[PDB]
Amino acid sequence: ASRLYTLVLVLQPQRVLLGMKKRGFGAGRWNGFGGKVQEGETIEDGARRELQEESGLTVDALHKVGQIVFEFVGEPELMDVHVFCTDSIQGTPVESDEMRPCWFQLDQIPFKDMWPDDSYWFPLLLQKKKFHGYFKFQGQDTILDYTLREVDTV
Numbered sequence: 041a042s043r044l045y046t047l048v049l050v051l052q053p054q055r056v057l058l059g060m061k062k063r064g065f066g067a068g069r070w071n072g073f074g075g076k077v078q079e080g081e082t083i084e085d086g087a088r089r090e091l092q093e094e095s096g097l098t099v100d101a102l103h104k105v106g107q108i109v110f111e112f113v114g115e116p117e118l119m120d121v122h123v124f125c126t127d128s129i130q131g132t133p134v135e136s137d138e139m140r141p142c143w144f145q146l147d148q149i150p151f152k153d154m155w156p157d158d159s160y161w162f163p164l165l166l167q168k169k170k171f172h173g174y175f176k177f178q179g180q181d182t183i184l185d186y187t188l189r190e191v192d193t194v
């Protein structure tokens with residue numbers, strides 16, 4: 041019982057782009073760009089589509105960097121999040137009613153205002169590692185348990 045989602049991090053040598061979500065799921069936190077994958081669409085094509093919808097940016101080549109499964113206690117459906125990176129984009133980030141993009145220097149990543157799992161896997165993303173994770177949450181602020189392992193193949 042899992043549902044597919046994407047998450048894309050625009051990661052350049054000295055800075056990363058995050059978006060502050062203004063409403064709906066994740067509102068009030070910084071995160072990368074993503075969403076649900078459609079019927080008949082590949083995961084990677086979903087990732088590309090959602091980056092455009094949410095940031096204004098056009099990506100060509102996406103690189104796989106992780107898979108993370110999220111469980112909320114009491115909720116039947118698991119989120120199966122496929123995480124991607126890119127360093128090369130076209131366009132300028134767009135602020136919309138849904139999202140406010142900003143660049144962050146890599147020593148100023150706003151962990152306190154991100155989902156709390158990110159403290160665990162973002163350091164791996166920054167060192168170009170790939171990973172499989174599982175995080176069990178109670179509500180949106182507490183991690184009850186987790187596993188996280190580096191992998192060679194996502």
Ligand SMILES: Cc1ccc(-c2nc(=O)[nH]c3ccccc23)cc1
Binds near residue numbers: 046071121158177
């Ligand atoms: C589309 C989409 C929405 C939310 C997330 C998401 N990102 C994180 O960094 N941590 C989480 C923790 C629990 C549930 C979701 C998340 C990813 C993708």
